[PDB]
């Protein structure tokens, strides 16, 4: 029983990504599109293409967005990718906290080497789905 040297642990890649993702969302939301490729999908309910994602984020207007991460779980998936499920609270522009469930699919960048990009991003508010 030894540690895998070839690939980074999926759980650490997910947690570190979530940490940086929501941090940048609070700081500079306009640079958030740099996490996605020209084939990624962004859904914030409430889109395929990085340029469409950039315009999508700006249309949401994130002004000092604070996030309380309640749960994060990340596993390894297809083609050495990482799938992450995130549950927590979201408060944007002074509005009160809203329970959400955001899921990511972290894909390894082409080359090289240990670089990842968001291949899938699905965001859903709880009060809009259940009530």
């Amino acid at each position: 029983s030894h540690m895998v040297m070839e690939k980074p642990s999926p759980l650490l890649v997910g947690r570190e990504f979530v940490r940086q993702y929501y941090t940048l969302l609070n700081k500079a939301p306009e640079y958030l599109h740099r996490f996605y490729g020209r084939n990624s999908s962004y859904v914030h309910g409430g889109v395929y293409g990085q340029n469409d994602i950039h315009h999508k984020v700006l249309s949401l207007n994130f002004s000092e967005c604070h996030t309380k991460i309640r749960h994060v779980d990340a596993h390894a998936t297809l083609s050495d990718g990482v799938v992450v499920q995130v549950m927590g609270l979201l408060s944007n522009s002074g509005q009160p906290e809203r329970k959400f469930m955001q899921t990511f699919v972290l894909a390894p960048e082409g080359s090289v080497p240990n670089k990842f990009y968001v291949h899938n991003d699905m965001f859903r508010y709880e009060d809009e789905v259940f009530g």
């Binding site: 980074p8 650490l12 890649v13 570190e16 990504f17 940086q20 993702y21 740099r34 996490f35 996605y36 972290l106 240990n114 670089k115 990842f116 990009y117 968001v118």
Partner: peptide, 8 residues
């Protein structure tokens, strides 16, 4: 471990 076009 880097994400996107960042060196952080």
């Amino acid at each position: 471990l880097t994400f996107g076009d960042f060196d952080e």
